[PDB]
Structure 1
Amino acid sequence: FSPVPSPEGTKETYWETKAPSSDVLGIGAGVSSGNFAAASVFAALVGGYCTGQVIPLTVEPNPLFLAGSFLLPYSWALHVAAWIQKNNGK
């Protein structure tokens, strides 16, 4: 009804292809699919290991293991980015 503002750098992200354009990856638009796939596997193993090392949680835990356990959900987004880049020829 009036112009709706969006921040500078807003681009068109609607896709009807097999995979979205690499622009949907933001700052990761230039990373290759091999690098996302290897980072995804790495993050999944390190995140699962760190998660496993602190499943009995105690009042004093190792702080690095806590931070490293956040790599398991991050790996899901990494392998989705690997599928997007492999189907974009990157």
Structure 2
Amino acid sequence: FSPVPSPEGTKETYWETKAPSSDVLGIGAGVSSGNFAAASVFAALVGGYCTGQVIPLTVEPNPLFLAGSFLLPYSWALHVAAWIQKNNGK
């Protein structure tokens, strides 16, 4: 009803193709699909290891294993980005 503002640099992300354009990856638009797929497997293994090593949680957990355990959900978004980049020819 009035012009709705968006932050500067907002671009069009609506897609009907096989994969969205790489611009939906934001800062990760130029990363290769191999680099996401390898980062995804690396993040899944190190995140799963770091998660697994502190499953009995103590009052003294290792802070590096806690922070490294966040790589498991991050790996999900990484392999989705790997799929998007392979289907954009990157």
Shared fold by TM > 0.5?
A: yes
How much identity, in percent, do the aligned residues show? 100
Superposed displacement of residue 26, structure 1 = 0.2
CA–CA separation in structure 2 for the residues paired with 1:62 and 1:6: 41
Map Cα deviations across residues 26-71 of structure 1 (whole Å, 9 max, x no partner).
0000000000000000000000000000000000111100000000
Can you give the 5+ residue segments of structure 2 that lack an aligned partner in the other structure? Answer: none
TM-score, normalisation: structure 2: 0.99
TM-score, normalisation: structure 1: 0.99
Can you give the 5+ residue segments of structure 1 that lack an aligned partner in the other structure? Answer: none
CA–CA separation in structure 2 for the residues paired with 1:6 and 1:75: 29
Superposed displacement of residue 82, structure 1 = 0.2
SS of the aligned residue for 2:54 comes to: coil
Coordinate RMSD, CA, aligned: 0.3
CA–CA separation in structure 2 for the residues paired with 1:27 and 1:63: 27
Matching residue of 1:57? 57
